[PDB]
Amino acid sequence: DDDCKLARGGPPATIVAIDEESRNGTILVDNMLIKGTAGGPDPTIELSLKDNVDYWVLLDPVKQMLFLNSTGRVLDRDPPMNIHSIVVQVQCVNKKVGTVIYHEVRIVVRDRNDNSPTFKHESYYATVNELTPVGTTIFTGFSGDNGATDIDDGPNGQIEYVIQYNPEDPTSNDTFEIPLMLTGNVVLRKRLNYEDKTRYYVIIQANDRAQNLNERRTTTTTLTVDLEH
């Protein structure tokens, strides 16, 4: 009869989503809603998983429930593991007819902001001529991937650079600015004077662009600016 066909309406594939790094035992699909019973006195169907690559999914055939199996590992969307989605088949065999139906399950794995920016170097350096006029770009060392980078995806992986106040060099964040935070190029804002001050310690904080401000992650570096003469 109809055992092994979907009991639910809708399309053939059972698509769900889940955050990376979800707890072992997370319920991926509460009920597959396949016609027939795999349990009880007189089961009309058999249910098992196919193409369960690396056994991320576990099936309870009687409940028709699918679970994440991550004991001793994490479901990681980021490099180096790069798990963007999991695809399994719920094979259903009709015991009476012999019919076989594969119920495809697709699990979209969502990125978490679980990584912070890292700067390529531990600190950065520029030399500036005392007569350099205001408005001049004096540091472009965050171009390429020589600045901060972040292994998350989309906005969770994009970078903004913001000069921070430095209590050890109070004037440094007045004397230099970053007008375009997405680039992190530093521009001279006030006239220099080699007779008064020869070094600035500029604190630059890189943040990622997570949707919500309070899940943003940040990292700090120092740009040391020496005047020449």
């Binding site: 399309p11 698509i15 019919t99 139906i101």
Partner: protein, 204 residues
Amino acid sequence: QVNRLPFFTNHFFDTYLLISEDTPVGSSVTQLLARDMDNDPLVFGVSGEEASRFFAVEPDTGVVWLRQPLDRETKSEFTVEFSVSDHQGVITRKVNIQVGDVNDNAPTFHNQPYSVRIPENTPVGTPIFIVNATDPDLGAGGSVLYSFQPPSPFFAIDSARGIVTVIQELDYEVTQAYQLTVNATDQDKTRPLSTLANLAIIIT
């Protein structure tokens, strides 16, 4: 007043966008929504070589249209990078696109032509032949059942396994050859598709 950058607000960026593979070329599949607190004029785009082959975006409205047919049998998941710009900043965001299956393939027989010689004294219940057909749609849509059209009083076919059995004593003198038509159908609830094949049974 430093520029405030725009941001996408579509709920799908948090989950995924489902698009049926029978969506026609030129149909609108969604509309990008963005907000800029400056209320700057916004320009919408798609980025990526793969993505821009399949979708186009109206730059002012953000209506996303399909450029060429989706095919669930070839590719059922895409990642698409959309962009929104206030002409001081390009913001990008990715969406996972899931292709919905329809029943769009009939079963295909293999190993044809089908032809088998059997002796007149072949017992009832004897397996004599196995037909095979496959069907790449999902689920019930891709699950093949076999039958004879019409059924034969001399031969049966197992609906699931495609094994042909003798169900009646043969008689060379009565009939020397049968030409049976094997139907292979998928089981799609509302739009089943089937395909026919000839089976010759030659008596000796």
